[PDB]
């Protein structure tokens, strides 16, 4: 029973970690779009 | 997983 409890506890931590990872992934995605846009803007500026 | 295995054993 104790072991089971421990496992359960671990699971929550794991879940939290996963959530964090997803958040980070989202952030990364957001950044990438900006970079894509930003590069284009830079190019435009150069042209001008 | 390890914990689960242990539980199974015991």
Q: How many Å apart are CA A39 and CA A35, to the nearest integer? A: 6
Q: How was this one solved?
A: cryo-EM
Minimum Cα–Cα distance from A6: chain B residue:
B3
CA distance B10 to A39: 60
Q: What is the 3-state secondary structure (H, E, C) of A1-46?
A: CHHHHHHHHHHHHHHHHHHHHHHHHHHHHHHHHHHHHHHHHHHHHH
- 3-class DSSP state of B10: coil
Task: Tell the burial category of A1 from Cβ atoms under 10 Å away from its Cβ (0-12, 13-18, 19+).
Answer: exposed
What does DSSP assign to residue B2?
Answer: H
Q: How far apart are CA A24 and CA A43, in angstroms?
A: 28
Distance (Å) from the alpha carbon of B7 to chain A's nearest alpha carbon = 6
Resolution in A: 3.8
Residues 1-48 of A with CB under 8 A from B: 3-4, 6-7, 10
Task: Find out whether A7 and B3 touch, Cβ atoms under 8 Å.
Answer: yes
SS3 assignment, position B5: helix
Nearest Cα residue to A6 out of B8, B7, B10: B7
- Count of helix runs (H) and strand runs (E) in chain B: 1, 0
Smallest CA–CA separation between A20 and chain B, in Å?
Answer: 22
């Amino acid at each position: 029973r104790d072991l089971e409890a421990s496992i359960a506890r671990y699971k929550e931590e794991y879940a939290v970690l996963i959530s964090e990872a997803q958040a980070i992934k989202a952030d990364l995605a957001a950044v990438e779009a900006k970079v894509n846009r930003s590069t284009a803007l830079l190019k435009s500026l150069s042209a001008e | 997983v390890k914990d689960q295995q242990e539980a199974e054993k015991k």
